[PDB]
Amino acid sequence: MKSVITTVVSAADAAGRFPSNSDLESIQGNIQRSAARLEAAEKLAGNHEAVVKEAGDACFAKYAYLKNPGEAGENQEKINKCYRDVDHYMRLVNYCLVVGGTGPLDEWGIAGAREVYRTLNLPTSAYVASIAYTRDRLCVPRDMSAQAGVEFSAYLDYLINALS
Amino acid sequence: MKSVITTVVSAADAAGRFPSNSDLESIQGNIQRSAARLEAAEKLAGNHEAVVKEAGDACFAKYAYLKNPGEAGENQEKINKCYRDVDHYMRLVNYCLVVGGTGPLDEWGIAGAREVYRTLNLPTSAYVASIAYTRDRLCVPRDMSAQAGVEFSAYLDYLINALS
Amino acid sequence: MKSVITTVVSAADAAGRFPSNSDLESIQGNIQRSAARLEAAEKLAGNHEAVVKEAGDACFAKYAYLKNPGEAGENQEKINKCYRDVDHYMRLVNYCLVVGGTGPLDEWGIAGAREVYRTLNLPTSAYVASIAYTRDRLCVPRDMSAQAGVEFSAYLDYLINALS
Amino acid sequence: AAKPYESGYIAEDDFWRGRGIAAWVYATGANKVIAQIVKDFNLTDKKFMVFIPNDGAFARLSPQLRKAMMEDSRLVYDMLAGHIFTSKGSAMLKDLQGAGYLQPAYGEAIGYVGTGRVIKIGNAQVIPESSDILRKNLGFSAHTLDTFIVPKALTKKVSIEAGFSPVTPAKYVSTTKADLRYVGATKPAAVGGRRAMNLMKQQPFWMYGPPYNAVTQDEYEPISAAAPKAFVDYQIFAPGTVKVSPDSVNANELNPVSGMSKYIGKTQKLVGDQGISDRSDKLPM
Amino acid sequence: ALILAQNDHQEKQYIKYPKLAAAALMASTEVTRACQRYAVPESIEEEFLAASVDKVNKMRGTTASGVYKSSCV
Amino acid sequence: MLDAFSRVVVNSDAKAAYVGGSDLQALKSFIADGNKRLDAVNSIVSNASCMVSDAVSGMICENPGLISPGGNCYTNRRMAACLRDGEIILRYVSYALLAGDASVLEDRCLNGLKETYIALGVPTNSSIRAVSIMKAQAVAFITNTATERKMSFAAGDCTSLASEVASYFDRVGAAIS
Amino acid sequence: MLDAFSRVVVNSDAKAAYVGGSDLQALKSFIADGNKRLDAVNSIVSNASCMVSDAVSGMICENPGLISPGGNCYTNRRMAACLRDGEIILRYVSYALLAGDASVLEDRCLNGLKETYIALGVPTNSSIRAVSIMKAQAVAFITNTATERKMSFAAGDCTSLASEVASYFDRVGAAIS
Amino acid sequence: MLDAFAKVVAQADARGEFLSNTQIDALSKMVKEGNQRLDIVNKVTSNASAIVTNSARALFAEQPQLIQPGGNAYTSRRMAACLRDMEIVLRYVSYAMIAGDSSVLDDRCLNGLRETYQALGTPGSSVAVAIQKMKDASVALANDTTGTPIGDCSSLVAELAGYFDRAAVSVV
Ligand SMILES: *C(=C)C1=C(C)[C@@H](Cc2[nH]c(/C=C3N=C(/C=C4\NC(=O)[C@H](C)[C@H]4CC)C(C)=C\3CCC(=O)O)c(CCC(=O)O)c2C)NC1=O
Ligand SMILES: *CC[C@H]1/C(=C/c2[nH]c(/C=C3N=C(/C=C4\NC(=O)C(CC)=C4C)C(C)=C\3CCC(=O)O)c(CCC(=O)O)c2C)NC(=O)[C@@H]1C
Ligand SMILES: C=CC1=C(C)[C@@H](Cc2[nH]c(/C=C3N=C(/C=C4\NC(=O)[C@H](C)[C@H]4CC)C(C)=C\3CCC(=O)O)c(CCC(=O)O)c2C)NC1=O
Numbered sequence A, B, C: 001m002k003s004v005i006t007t008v009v010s011a012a013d014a015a016g017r018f019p020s021n022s023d024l025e026s027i028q029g030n031i032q033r034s035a036a037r038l039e040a041a042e043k044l045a046g047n048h049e050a051v052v053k054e055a056g057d058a059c060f061a062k063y064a065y066l067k068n069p070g071e072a073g074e075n076q077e078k079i080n081k082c083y084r085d086v087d088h089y090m091r092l093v094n095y096c097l098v099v100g101g102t103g104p105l106d107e108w109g110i111a112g113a114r115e116v117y118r119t120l121n122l123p124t125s126a127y128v129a130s131i132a133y134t135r136d137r138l139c140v141p142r143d144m145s146a147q148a149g150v151e152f153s154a155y156l157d158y159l160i161n162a163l164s
Numbered sequence D: 001a002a003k004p005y006e007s008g009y010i011a012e013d014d015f016w017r018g019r020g021i022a023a024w025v026y027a028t029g030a031n032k033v034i035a036q037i038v039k040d041f042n043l044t045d046k047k048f049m050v051f052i053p054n055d056g057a058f059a060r061l062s063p064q065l066r067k068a069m070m071e072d073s074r075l076v077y078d079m080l081a082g083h084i085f086t087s088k089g090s091a092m093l094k095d096l097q098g099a100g101y102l103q104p105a106y107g108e109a110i111g112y113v114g115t116g117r118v119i120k121i122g123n124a125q126v127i128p129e130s131s132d133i134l135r136k137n138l139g140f141s142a143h144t145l146d147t148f149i150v151p152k153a154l155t156k157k158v159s160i161e162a163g164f165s166p167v168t169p170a171k172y173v174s175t176t177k178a179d180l181r182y183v184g185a186t187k188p189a190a191v192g193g194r195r196a197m198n199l200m201k202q203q204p205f206w207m208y209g210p211p212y213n214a215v216t217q218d219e220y221e222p223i224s225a226a227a228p229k230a231f232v233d234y235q236i237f238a239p240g241t242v243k244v245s246p247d248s249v250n251a252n253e254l255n256p257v258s259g260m261s262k263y264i265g266k267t268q269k270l271v272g273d274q275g276i277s278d279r280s281d282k283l284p285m
Numbered sequence E: 001a002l003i004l005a006q007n008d009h010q011e012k013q014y015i016k017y018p019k020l021a022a023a024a025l026m027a028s029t030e031v032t033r034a035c036q037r038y039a040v041p042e043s044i045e046e047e048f049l050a051a052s053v054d055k056v057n058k059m060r061g062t063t064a065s066g067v068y069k070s071s072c073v
Numbered sequence F, G: 001m002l003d004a005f006s007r008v009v010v011n012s013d014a015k016a017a018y019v020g021g022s023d024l025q026a027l028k029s030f031i032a033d034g035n036k037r038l039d040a041v042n043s044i045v046s047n048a049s050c051m052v053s054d055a056v057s058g059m060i061c062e063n064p065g066l067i068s069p070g071g072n073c074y075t076n077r078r079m080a081a082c083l084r085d086g087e088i089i090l091r092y093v094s095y096a097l098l099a100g101d102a103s104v105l106e107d108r109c110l111n112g113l114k115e116t117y118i119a120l121g122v123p124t125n126s127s128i129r130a131v132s133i134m135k136a137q138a139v140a141f142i143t144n145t146a147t148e149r150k151m152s153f154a155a156g157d158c159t160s161l162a163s164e165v166a167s168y169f170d171r172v173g174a175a176i177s
Numbered sequence H: 001m002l003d004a005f006a007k008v009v010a011q012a013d014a015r016g017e018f019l020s021n022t023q024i025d026a027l028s029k030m031v032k033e034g035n036q037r038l039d040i041v042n043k044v045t046s047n048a049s050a051i052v053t054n055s056a057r058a059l060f061a062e063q064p065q066l067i068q069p070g071g072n073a074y075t076s077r078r079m080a081a082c083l084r085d086m087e088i089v090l091r092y093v094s095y096a097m098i099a100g101d102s103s104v105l106d107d108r109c110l111n112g113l114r115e116t117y118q119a120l121g122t123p124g125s126s127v128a129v130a131i132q133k134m135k136d137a138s139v140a141l142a143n144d145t146t147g148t149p150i151g152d153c154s155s156l157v158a159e160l161a162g163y164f165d166r167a168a169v170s171v172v
């Protein structure tokens, strides 16, 4: 998993040397920013079904053509799996808010996603539009704190730039 | 130079990817611990000739046999270069207190030192005993602050474990 | 004894109320602060032989006139009873660190002291000289921790303010 | 050993009680053992030297070494005799410069290395700040150490494998609600009745949809099979008694653009909660 | 008496001896003149405001029936 | 009044001893389980209103002679005073359990209560029963074994606080006897 | 490779549950105790060479058949390889102590070390003795009970870290055992 | 196969040295619990069929795919094999609980179970979910009085849950 600890022990293992002062200095900042990212992750965990419901209809509101026959959102089985995949992506974002890095995103949602979405005829723009809608409905004092919103929108922009 | 910034940009360059949140999270801890290591480095810079004069004496006092003929400390030219090399090591420790990592030590004093000290018949135990004496004469509130002493003794132990 | 406990349940008893959430909430701070204020308790309890010794001669070093005939410390048994009083006051400060309030001080050293010290010609300035000498000799990382030193000095100066 | 002030602090033991370095000497009873070591070796006349490990040095004795010291009195006696040195009189901190040896009262000679203000007596560092104390009566000089002088000859039987390896017992963190509910699933179904299904948990709202089709707990109870023949006329009543309310008055709340609706269809099943029921409080019958 | 006592022995004394607790409450209101025999109202507002409280206090000088008790005589 | 912390201070003041490390094992164990004591007091003060009407009605159901004409609980005024008592004793017992020491119980509630109930003609046998039913409710509410109210708690053992409040209630009963 | 933070991620991904509320107590206590953890890994890292040399010298001075002619630490090549073998295990245990999880110790050090020493003819028992000596040095260096060198720490309690590094050290012994 | 008493002896022969007194009062404490531990295993073996059937029923009301036609829980042969695979792990968890050490659990239950389930195509994660549902019911059933003296058993139910988690991570 790409995180703060793993990068520096992997670098020290590649160099074959003991943990120096720079490695521990990198963990002090993890201690600092965990006060914001953990209470971002907790607020995402406590209210996730509202956000997954709210961002799911923005996809079909922007792209109403998916419910036509021949498309990828015809019957209820496709829309249910659409909501399930959006919930999967929100869970991976909650995981990356906890681990401190983009590890769980890069390995459980991003790597290999392009071949699946091209093969199974899933348009990536509508997998993107839900994440884009989720980012813009984030006010600074209401939904979370100030740094928690920065920490949340950074992972949202990472997922958006990965799928686009 | 081995530091906090260089490790994470080298890791991101080896992976071929942009700086993520974990990279910036590692720099917040540099921002945190620079308040202690810089005022350790400044106090070392302002009073270095007292510590070097003191350090050199300890080595001779422990190993009085170096002033015998046939040894490596016969005349004044050897003792002057002994004090010069001890001052070099203290300057590299001041540099590593500034850069945040063990870069200037590992490349300007440590790499290749074993071949030189074996070839030129320089006993490494007496190059170690001055650094060992410098570490033990560090009291917690008098010489510097509490975390500055930790930051100083960590690089001293790094140099000692490298030459031993 | 006035403590965190005996304050909030006498305020409840005077109003005839059950222990409310404020009464429970006040004792939650007695859980956090008791890690710091009890750490000074065994520190004073184990080294209580050198502190009385170092305060008693500082009292007579500030006021050498007390050993004159007709004064308070003219003979040996009066100085023996003088060191016993500083031992008593340090024992009451040790008790107040354990209860968490100024209970035992106000019951056993403060109430009625201003009558007996005027009746028996004991100068209160020589009493507060020893407590002030204990107060400025608190090496905040060496004697105890930081917050234990704060809790210790806050009980020393309370006795100083009450005796003057 | 009675009171340190009475007659000031002139007596030998009271003077040391007034110093703050080694309080452990009287906290325990090592003062009696060291006195017996000053009479067993006739150290009284010849001017000797003593190294005292201060408080904190005593507080950092390893548990397996302290246990050995408290289960063998000869070990304590040897360790204490190894802190009293007759080799070179009552020397100060200016006579220990260089690397040499000192002769203990009993043990074998112990190496010391003094380089200015940093003096080591082997395994232990002298605290220069509070030392060089010479007592004229009973002539000897006193120095303070950061650690007990522990020769390798005495701590050869002390091992961490002998039962001092640090272990922290782990504990569970369940709740009363969970345990009360789960305990009903431990009885046989012919006895437990409805409670036999009490080990199931809420699942993500999409697990109840077409592909997965997770069953809720309300589907295992007779309440989901009630379809009686009788019915209420809903006309016999005088006007003004029947009441009707919707869940909302809005087009795209009762049914969004997509098919994900909580009020119309078969998708009102796809809700995060509602996966279990608290109707197992009634009875076991 | 248990809320005006300062030390714990002084509250223990009022606890053990009831006449001592009757007398301390009187002596406490005499040295700081909060009795009604020294209370002077300032405005006619406050005079009526004191009259209301006193009308409540006189009502406990009668029985639950309404018969005058032998205390207020 | 005293609490659990000051109780060892008057014990050490009787010999002019400093409170050392031997004395603090009893008090650091008082702090360790400080969350369970607050969780135990909160369960009692939550159902304290039901506890008095539970206990006094149980005391009535056993001895109809209290509501008999001339009986001690015969008048509405006397029944209100008995319910007023059921609450004062429950209040001081919850003070003593919160403080961890029985000191505030037996100088503010029980000191002088026996000769008061003797001088009033309050039946002692009937009293004992009103306190024992409240004790039985206290052990049920602390150990979460009431019949028709269960409260949310973190899992663990609580028989020590239940035994402590059971030790306070028979102190009350032996005082009024 | 998983740390303490990633371990709850993999535990709750088997759940398909969000992490929040219940699972955050251990992570917030891990964060609040992080200065002691860095303070302990620094103390182990600063004394590495003396620890490795002292452990191998102790293993030889307890069993002198290793430097016997035909023993496994006989020549200079085998002795240098044994010092390297010990130093690598200390490096990986330091990694596992820094990360707060022993998953990095399993994947890169212990996966197949059991029969590697078998194919080499390395004696299993001696290596366990060297590992236990390194463990005994590590707990004394963490808890500042080292007799040869005293370090500077803020006052407090960190025996949880000592139990965790003792829990890492016996794990290694078991794999090669 | 070791018990917790044989553990310290097997580590004492290795150093060739007598048990010191700290290991002995570590063991007399473990004896001094004693009755609590057997109360725990008595509660689990009294209700074993209920634990197994309720956990399997919750597993299939949760995951209906195993009993779907084509599922791994299809037919009788496979369903019967699944019913008492769980009862095997319950039996060996109770053996390890009475032994005080997870040595019988690793020897003859968890040794090679992973490639056994791989070679058959059995999904090991669902086996782990079944193990977790048996664990929850066992720790729920363990801490009730049911006519036992009141006390704390927390250090024993933590060990009982640890045996279940050791079984659950080793299967998958
Ligand atoms: C008369 C003959 C008679 C009664 C009247 C009745 C009273 C009684 N109740 C108990 C035991 C309990 N009483 C409790 C009090 C309450 N129960 C509640 O749930 C609410 C919160 C509150 C009153 C509104 C409690 C908690 C108990 C313990 C068990 C439980 O779960 O309820 C006793 C003593 C023991 C007994 O006799 O049952 C009495 C006298 N019972 C009568 O017999
Ligand atoms: C809840 C049921 C889960 C499940 C079980 C399952 N197992 C099998 C098949 C076998 N299981 C074993 C297991 C053991 N044998 C042993 O001796 C021991 C003691 C340590 C164990 C744990 C073996 C040998 C088999 C093959 C023999 C057979 O069962 O006929 C099967 C299917 C049977 C088959 O594969 O033909 C099931 C269904 N699988 C699940 O889906 C559940 C999660
Ligand atoms: C753990 C990480 C993880 C993920 C991120 C998701 C990723 C993911 N999504 C889908 C699958 C899907 N994603 C969609 C979604 C859409 N298609 C549309 O018509 C709209 C554009 C949009 C609605 C939001 C649909 C319809 C499928 C099912 C495709 C199909 O079966 O035809 C699939 C195929 C398997 C399946 O779900 O049946 C996978 C692997 N799954 C994971 O396991």
Ligand SMILES: C=CC1=C(C)[C@@H](Cc2[nH]c(/C=C3N=C(/C=C4\NC(=O)[C@H](C)[C@H]4CC)C(C)=C\3CCC(=O)O)c(CCC(=O)O)c2C)NC1=O
Pocket (backbone or CB within 6 Å): A043, A044, A047, A050, A051, A054, A134, A137, A138, A139, A140, A142, A143, A144
């Ligand atoms: C944890 C993840 C999380 C988010 C991504 C956001 C997203 C979000 N917004 C709203 C809900 C809302 N959001 C707003 C928006 C705003 N209100 C203001 O005071 C601002 C000026 C402005 C933001 C710029 C308003 C007005 C509502 C209520 C009406 C609505 O449903 O949109 C809701 C429904 C619950 C609620 O009432 O808050 C959610 C989940 N909030 C979250 O909790």
Ligand SMILES: C=CC1=C(C)[C@@H](Cc2[nH]c(/C=C3N=C(/C=C4\NC(=O)[C@H](C)[C@H]4CC)C(C)=C\3CCC(=O)O)c(CCC(=O)O)c2C)NC1=O
Pocket (backbone or CB within 6 Å): B056, B059, B066, B071, B072, B073, B077, B078, B079, B081, B082, B083, B085, B086, B088, B089, B108, B109, B116, B120, B122, B123, B126, B127
């Ligand atoms: C920038 C990094 C940097 C360093 C760390 C030093 C490292 C260093 N030290 C010495 C060189 C030395 N170091 C010593 C020191 C000693 N020998 C003794 O007898 C005592 C053991 C001890 C005294 C403290 C001596 C005597 C020499 C000179 C060796 C010689 O010329 O024979 C030399 C050989 C060149 C020279 O100095 O003339 C070098 C490269 N120089 C550097 O440029």
Ligand SMILES: C=CC1=C(C)[C@@H](Cc2[nH]c(/C=C3N=C(/C=C4\NC(=O)[C@H](C)[C@H]4CC)C(C)=C\3CCC(=O)O)c(CCC(=O)O)c2C)NC1=O
Pocket (backbone or CB within 6 Å): B043, B044, B047, B050, B051, B134, B137, B138, B139, B140, B142, B143, B144, D117, D129
């Ligand atoms: C920047 C690098 C730096 C160091 C490595 C140390 C090293 C050091 N120590 C001393 C000087 C001293 N150091 C001490 C030692 C102590 N005094 C105490 O209060 C403590 C109890 C005890 C430390 C454990 C004493 C007593 C002196 C004065 C006597 C002497 O020269 O040693 C001096 C001479 C200047 C001075 O007076 O401080 C130096 C450079 N101090 C530094 O500034």
Ligand SMILES: C=CC1=C(C)[C@@H](Cc2[nH]c(/C=C3N=C(/C=C4\NC(=O)[C@H](C)[C@H]4CC)C(C)=C\3CCC(=O)O)c(CCC(=O)O)c2C)NC1=O
Pocket (backbone or CB within 6 Å): C056, C059, C066, C072, C073, C078, C079, C081, C082, C083, C085, C086, C088, C089, C108, C109, C116, C120, C122, C123, C124, C126, C127
């Ligand atoms: C529990 C709290 C407690 C105390 C604080 C002391 C207070 C105290 N001191 C003295 C009595 C005395 N106290 C002193 C002490 C001093 N004179 C000085 O000039 C210095 C200020 C100081 C020594 C440092 C002396 C010299 C006497 C003897 C006076 C006399 O006997 O008349 C007495 C009279 C009875 C007695 O002799 O003990 C009392 C009550 N005793 C207590 O029980």
Ligand SMILES: C=CC1=C(C)[C@@H](Cc2[nH]c(/C=C3N=C(/C=C4\NC(=O)[C@H](C)[C@H]4CC)C(C)=C\3CCC(=O)O)c(CCC(=O)O)c2C)NC1=O
Pocket (backbone or CB within 6 Å): B141, C043, C044, C047, C050, C051, C054, C137, C138, C139, C140, C142, C143, C144, D018, D019, D020, D021, D129, D130
């Ligand atoms: C229970 C709490 C507790 C304390 C408050 C101290 C109190 C204390 N320290 C010292 C004794 C000492 N105290 C210090 C400490 C300092 N000297 C300075 O100049 C600085 C201001 C300060 C450190 C920052 C030193 C260096 C000594 C030894 C020499 C001296 O007396 O100054 C003494 C004299 C007797 C003795 O040597 O022990 C006392 C009472 N120790 C404790 O156990």
Ligand SMILES: C=CC1=C(C)[C@@H](Cc2[nH]c(/C=C3N=C(/C=C4\NC(=O)[C@H](C)[C@H]4CC)C(C)=C\3CCC(=O)O)c(CCC(=O)O)c2C)NC1=O
Pocket (backbone or CB within 6 Å): F056, F066, F072, F073, F077, F078, F079, F081, F082, F083, F084, F085, F086, F088, F089, F108, F109, F113, F116, F120, F122, F123, F126, F127, F130
């Ligand atoms: C500070 C502590 C404190 C208490 C403990 C109570 C107790 C108490 N109760 C009464 C007074 C009374 N107490 C009772 C109580 C009872 N009679 C019974 O038969 C039952 C056994 C029991 C109720 C359960 C009754 C019935 C009276 C009224 C007697 C009367 O009016 O004649 C009185 C006299 C004052 C009065 O008349 O009201 C006191 C002091 N009040 C306090 O201030």
Ligand SMILES: C=CC1=C(C)[C@@H](Cc2[nH]c(/C=C3N=C(/C=C4\NC(=O)[C@H](C)[C@H]4CC)C(C)=C\3CCC(=O)O)c(CCC(=O)O)c2C)NC1=O
Pocket (backbone or CB within 6 Å): C021, C024, C025, C028, D176, F032, F033, F034, F035, F036, F038, F039, F040, F042, F142, F143, F144, F153, F154, F155, F156, F157, F158, F161
């Ligand atoms: C201001 C108000 C205030 C409170 C009400 C308490 C609330 C409270 N109770 C407990 C915590 C607890 N409470 C109990 C008590 C019990 N559990 C049972 O199963 C028994 C029925 C009952 C015994 C009497 C136990 C066993 C714990 C966990 C152990 C502990 O934390 O000490 C905790 C710690 C766990 C947590 O919630 O984070 C807290 C904060 N504390 C407060 O600060």
Ligand SMILES: C=CC1=C(C)[C@@H](Cc2[nH]c(/C=C3N=C(/C=C4\NC(=O)[C@H](C)[C@H]4CC)C(C)=C\3CCC(=O)O)c(CCC(=O)O)c2C)NC1=O
Pocket (backbone or CB within 6 Å): A024, A025, A027, A028, B033, B146, B147, B150, G032, G033, G034, G035, G036, G038, G039, G040, G042, G142, G143, G144, G153, G154, G155, G156, G157, G158, G159, G161
């Ligand atoms: C950023 C890089 C970084 C480091 C270089 C180390 C340095 C370090 N250690 C501690 C601080 C500490 N370190 C310890 C640990 C110990 N103390 C002992 O007495 C034992 C011997 C040992 C554990 C067994 C303790 C107990 C504290 C006090 C604060 C705390 O408990 O977290 C602190 C916080 C307080 C302070 O600033 O002093 C720091 C920065 N930690 C870091 O975060």
Ligand SMILES: C=CC1=C(C)[C@@H](Cc2[nH]c(/C=C3N=C(/C=C4\NC(=O)[C@H](C)[C@H]4CC)C(C)=C\3CCC(=O)O)c(CCC(=O)O)c2C)NC1=O
Pocket (backbone or CB within 6 Å): G056, G066, G072, G073, G077, G078, G079, G081, G082, G083, G085, G086, G088, G089, G108, G109, G113, G116, G120, G122, G123, G126, G127, G130
């Ligand atoms: C990533 C983890 C990792 C390790 C743990 C080591 C494991 C390891 N050790 C050795 C190799 C060895 N390891 C030892 C060590 C010992 N033999 C003894 O008798 C003592 C008990 C013990 C030293 C304390 C020795 C002596 C050899 C060399 C054997 C030989 O030369 O024949 C080899 C063979 C390759 C070689 O070094 O030549 C390997 C893979 N290497 C790794 O890459």
Ligand SMILES: C=CC1=C(C)[C@@H](Cc2[nH]c(/C=C3N=C(/C=C4\NC(=O)[C@H](C)[C@H]4CC)C(C)=C\3CCC(=O)O)c(CCC(=O)O)c2C)NC1=O
Pocket (backbone or CB within 6 Å): D062, D156, D158, D159, D160, D161, G047, G050, G051, G054, G055, G057, G058, G059, G061, G062, G132, G133, G136, G137, G140, G141, G145, G146, G147, G148, G149
């Ligand atoms: C016959 C061969 C033989 C040896 C080579 C030594 C080796 C040795 N050292 C220690 C024990 C130890 N070894 C160290 C390590 C060190 N201590 C320091 O002062 C240095 C900084 C550092 C390198 C020397 C520490 C810190 C301890 C335990 C505590 C202490 O001594 O302070 C132990 C006990 C381990 C255990 O408990 O099982 C052994 C066997 N002893 C022997 O019997």
Ligand SMILES: C=CC1=C(C)[C@@H](Cc2[nH]c(/C=C3N=C(/C=C4\NC(=O)[C@H](C)[C@H]4CC)C(C)=C\3CCC(=O)O)c(CCC(=O)O)c2C)NC1=O
Pocket (backbone or CB within 6 Å): H034, H035, H036, H037, H038, H039, H040, H142, H143, H144, H145, H148, H149, H150, H151, H152, H153, H156
């Ligand atoms: C056939 C096997 C067999 C047994 C197990 C025991 C069963 C048993 N357990 C206990 C005794 C006990 N049993 C328990 C256990 C518990 N109490 C609780 O509240 C929890 C629900 C549960 C913990 C899991 C406790 C805690 C004690 C002792 C009471 C105490 O230690 O305070 C006693 C009383 C004698 C004694 O205390 O030693 C007996 C006979 N006897 C047997 O013959």
